[PDB]
Design an enzyme around this catalytic site. Structure first.
Site, PDB file in Angstrom:
ATOM      1  N   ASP B  14       0.874  -1.176   0.000  1.00  0.00           N
ATOM      2  CA  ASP B  14       0.000   0.000   0.000  1.00  0.00           C
ATOM      3  C   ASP B  14       0.913   1.228   0.000  1.00  0.00           C
ATOM      4  OD1 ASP B  14      -1.884   1.988   0.465  1.00  0.00           O
ATOM      5  OD2 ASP B  14      -2.275   1.440   2.564  1.00  0.00           O
ATOM      6  N   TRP B  39       5.515  -3.728   7.706  1.00  0.00           N
ATOM      7  CA  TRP B  39       4.540  -4.781   7.658  1.00  0.00           C
ATOM      8  C   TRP B  39       5.129  -5.914   6.803  1.00  0.00           C
ATOM      9  CZ3 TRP B  39       3.355   0.242   5.456  1.00  0.00           C
ATOM     10  CH2 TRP B  39       3.157   0.256   4.096  1.00  0.00           C
ATOM     11  N   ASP B  58       9.280   1.065   4.435  1.00  0.00           N
ATOM     12  CA  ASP B  58       9.085   2.310   3.747  1.00  0.00           C
ATOM     13  C   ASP B  58      10.396   3.075   3.703  1.00  0.00           C
ATOM     14  OD1 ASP B  58       6.342   1.774   3.284  1.00  0.00           O
ATOM     15  OD2 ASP B  58       5.758   2.754   5.162  1.00  0.00           O
ATOM     16  N   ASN B  86      -1.406  -3.038   6.528  1.00  0.00           N
ATOM     17  CA  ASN B  86      -0.798  -2.040   5.647  1.00  0.00           C
ATOM     18  C   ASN B  86      -1.540  -0.743   5.484  1.00  0.00           C
ATOM     19  OD1 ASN B  86      -2.683  -2.483   3.639  1.00  0.00           O
ATOM     20  ND2 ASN B  86      -1.294  -3.547   2.212  1.00  0.00           N
ATOM     21  N   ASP B  87      -2.482  -0.456   6.387  1.00  0.00           N
ATOM     22  CA  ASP B  87      -3.155   0.853   6.359  1.00  0.00           C
ATOM     23  C   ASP B  87      -2.543   1.821   7.368  1.00  0.00           C
ATOM     24  OD1 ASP B  87      -4.901  -0.168   4.453  1.00  0.00           O
ATOM     25  OD2 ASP B  87      -6.429  -0.644   5.958  1.00  0.00           O
ATOM     26  N   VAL B  88      -1.355   1.501   7.870  1.00  0.00           N
ATOM     27  CA  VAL B  88      -0.615   2.393   8.720  1.00  0.00           C
ATOM     28  C   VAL B  88       0.692   2.759   8.057  1.00  0.00           C
ATOM     29  CG1 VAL B  88      -1.678   1.726  10.908  1.00  0.00           C
ATOM     30  CG2 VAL B  88       0.313   0.431  10.082  1.00  0.00           C
TER      31      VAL B  88
HETATM   32  N1  LIG Z   1       1.003   2.475   3.967  1.00  0.00           N
HETATM   33  C1  LIG Z   1       1.718   3.756   3.760  1.00  0.00           C
HETATM   34  C2  LIG Z   1       0.920   4.810   4.433  1.00  0.00           C
HETATM   35  C3  LIG Z   1       1.472   6.053   4.641  1.00  0.00           C
HETATM   36  C4  LIG Z   1       0.740   7.050   5.279  1.00  0.00           C
HETATM   37  C5  LIG Z   1      -0.554   6.786   5.717  1.00  0.00           C
HETATM   38  C6  LIG Z   1      -1.098   5.521   5.500  1.00  0.00           C
HETATM   39  C7  LIG Z   1      -0.367   4.529   4.870  1.00  0.00           C
END
Ligand SMILES: NCc1ccccc1
Ligand SMILES: NCc1ccccc1
Lengths: 359, 110, 110, 360
Positions: B14, B39, B58, B86-88
């Site tokens: 993501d 993740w 990242d 993966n939403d963080v």
């Molecule tokens: N999965 C990367 C991301 C970055 C910022 C906010 C949400 C997700």
């Protein structure tokens, strides 16, 4: 003519909705766009810097945002904050300092919530160790850090208690936290296991009633947490799916993907066919309307590729959101009626919310 | 092939693929910083028929790359299974948390 | 319309029309601050056939509105005729210079 | 495998171009995109916060940016800065504090320049009163505020002198500033009037030679400032236009809309037909190539809706830019030849620049 500032939003609070635009392509300039749902008019906006989150105070008077700054954006000291904004003037009033671990992530409702009485903001931290932070709005202070919630995720307020909320934990059960009037933990409890984390993971988004919450699973099952007493009682699964539905592999998908109409017990869920591993965030082919009392579907309508929704109880409305466009539905009857679409409400939004009218 | 979201090892990305952003699958673009945390995805390699653990670190400290955005979700789970989620922003613990792009680092056999 | 770039008063707008941004042609959207300075346009009113001075004050202190972008250049001149020039941020001297939207304030007959 | 950072840009300097993306829709997240012009590859980027400006050091080692921060972006204390970045690592090295009046505006070359010797950055301020700021790069200091340039706009370095530049003033003439070794004003002079501000306004973008600069007007005239001698000699107009051109109302339009190929004296200009009041920033219907010695047009080619350009003297190239896409031309002969288009290089860019090669 003379240019003036200091003006208030032109439409009444009861017309207003809040589209949280992540602006993922330029995520340091996220913002909340304020719209009138009755006519699609753009009313104003609140800047929310890097990956902002937003909610409106339960009394309707203030907007709360949560965001991260750095002294030089991509370098320098970090400041995680909650900001209080006036709802009608859309002006900044107060910054509340947070420890530098507020959740950075997509805009699920449960990452940034408040107690039913509105006195405390309840937010998710990740450092990446997880805990829940409590902000005393009146004092403008971070007052509690709930480390008991380590290994859990998201905040589900209990609407039948003034300062209670639940979180979903890695054991497949729920942790309930009851805050004192000082915002410090007053008590807690842990439920029995509600779902199998491995075998039938649930979506975190609750379909929230006054005294119970329903959750849907990756495979289309439904679980419930009844908090009519001090101990939460859990149950499920029942299936969303009949045999015909199973034949075409219908499953839920989306982000803020469910909603509950409390007066009727109808639960709204985004669904798509041909479900399989990896489709749990697919746009909706349909919205299904479930009777939570009889545990059966009553209606199904086109989904308009929606990903997220929210419900207004008192006007009997549902909004859906596909990332960019907001659809407005009348849900006063079992079949939702599409009233209008607001095009270009956001570039990259997964969350829309109504201005509260309940007080 | 590697710049495509359906490249086999990108099965839970993501974000923006770093290989489209002046880096590679396993190197940050110049002036962006690897995350120490990530993740994890389990992705099927259709060329040898085996499953591999992929660590999605990242690259951080620069603004959004904007190129080769993917949102693939194979075996991804919600935040109560945090390191499968993966939403963080997995740059969350970096000196600068601004998200630039995502890498897909092969750890080994699943 | 007033929300159209072709509306007669908008003849030298480089920016977003505030009337599309929760404001009006002469009022800043809520929470954005008027600039005390502006660039000036001379625009023809096709209704009465007269030319008018229009003062293009920006509204400032919020990020870009993004709606109703216009880039009209009637009687606009470069920065050596500074107050006739619209490729600069007329929020430049505000407490916060972030540009939100542009208003079209009628000054009087040219 | 292990993820690593600390890497340098993958393509050599001579392949690099810098596309200044204002990202006007989200102007607080402007950035510089680095591309390889030979194959369209994206190489990296430099974040530049609100309405960044950019240039490359004359010696090719560093990238200079100019930007504005606030403590809380839309509120809090303002910091206007120049930043020095390493060109090969695309990493931040140094911030140089500016007074809080650096020009906020679209990316004309002349708002953020450097002396020929590379020792000083020369930038435009507007408070809204205008002045020119001088930054000593090595020292990391803001050396002086040239308030003598009040009522003038933009910076045109004189390539035949180490620390001299000109600016265009509201009297229709040029002010020349000569700096001392400390960056302070050592002397200045004003030219005679070159153009009528009211009747024939010029575009600010110069077509810059080693010892003279040419300028085009809203109505398709050309003016010149010659700085080969002690003081600037001005002349013009001559017309870009023949009778047929005039009958179709061809005029220039764009932003960084001209360029000069110094070895040949060819000047490149974006033009469009049906010109009238308000069309001076229209996209190019065509590019015209003028011989500045003979004052004749030697080529005309499709404009591809371009708005800005830049010329590389060392490789005989012209880039053009339509806001989002970069076109690469070979200009070694009078008719330019289109080599390729780099699509999606920016969302909202009005300025592209080559990485410097040679140029001593
Ligand atoms: N999965 C990367 C991301 C970055 C910022 C906010 C949400 C997700
Ligand atoms: N008023 C036009 C404008 C605003 C901000 C930046 C540049 C130009």
């Amino acid at each position: 003519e003379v240019l003036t500032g200091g003006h208030s939003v032109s439409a009444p609070q009861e017309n207003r909705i809040y589209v949280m635009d992540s602006v993922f392509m330029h995520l340091t300039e996220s913002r909340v766009h304020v719209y009138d749902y009755t006519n699609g008019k753009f009313l104003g906006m609140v800047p929310t810097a890097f990956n902002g989150h937003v909610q409106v105070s339960n009394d309707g008077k203030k907007i709360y945002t949560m965001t991260t700054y750095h002294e030089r954006i991509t370098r320098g000291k970090r400041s995680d904050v909650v900001e209080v904004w006036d709802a009608d003037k859309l002006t900044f009033e107060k910054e509340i300092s947070l420890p530098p671990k507020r959740v950075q992530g997509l805009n699920y409702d449960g990452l940034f919530r408040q107690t039913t009485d509105g006195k405390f903001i309840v937010l998710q931290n990740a450092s990446p160790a997880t805990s829940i932070g409590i902000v005393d709005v009146a004092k403008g202070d971070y007052v509690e850090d709930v480390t008991a919630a380590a290994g859990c995720w998201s905040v589900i307020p209990q609407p039948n208690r003034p300062r209670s909320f639940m979180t979903i934990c890695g054991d497949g059960g729920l942790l309930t936290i009851n805050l004192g009037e000082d915002g410090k933990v007053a008590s807690q409890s842990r439920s029995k296991q509600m779902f199998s984390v491995a075998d039938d993971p649930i979506f975190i988004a609750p379909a929230l009633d006054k005294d119970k919450a329903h959750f849907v699973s990756y495979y289309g099952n439904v679980y419930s947490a009844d908090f009519s007493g001090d101990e939460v009682k859990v149950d499920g699964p029942w299936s969303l799916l009949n045999d015909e539905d199973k034949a075409k592999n219908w499953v839920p998908g989306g982000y803020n993907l469910v909603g509950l109409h409390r007066a009727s017990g109808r639960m709204y869920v985004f669904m798509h066919p041909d479900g399989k591993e990896g489709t749990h965030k697919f746009p909706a082919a349909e919205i299904w309307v479930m009777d939570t009392k009889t545990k059966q579907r009553v209606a199904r309508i086109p989904g308009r590729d929606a990903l997220s929704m929210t419900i207004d109880q008192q006007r009997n409305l549902m909004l859906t959101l596909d990332g960019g466009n907001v659809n407005v539905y009348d849900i006063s009857q079992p079949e939702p009626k599409l009233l209008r679409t607001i095009e270009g409400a956001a570039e990259a939004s997964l969350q829309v919310q109504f201005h509260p009218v309940g007080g | 092939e590697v710049n495509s979201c359906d490249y086999w090892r990108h099965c839970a990305v993501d974000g923006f693929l770093c290989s489209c952003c002046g880096g590679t699958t396993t190197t940050c673009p110049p002036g962006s910083t690897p995350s120490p945390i990530s993740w994890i995805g389990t992705c099927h390699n259709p060329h040898d028929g085996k499953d591999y653990l992929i660590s999605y670190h990242d690259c951080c400290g620069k603004t959004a790359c904007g190129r080769c955005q993917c949102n693939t979700q194979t075996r991804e789970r919600p935040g109560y299974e945090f390191f499968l989620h993966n939403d963080v922003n997995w740059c969350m613990a970096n000196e600068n948390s601004t998200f630039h792009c995502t890498t897909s680092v092969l750890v080994g056999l699943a």
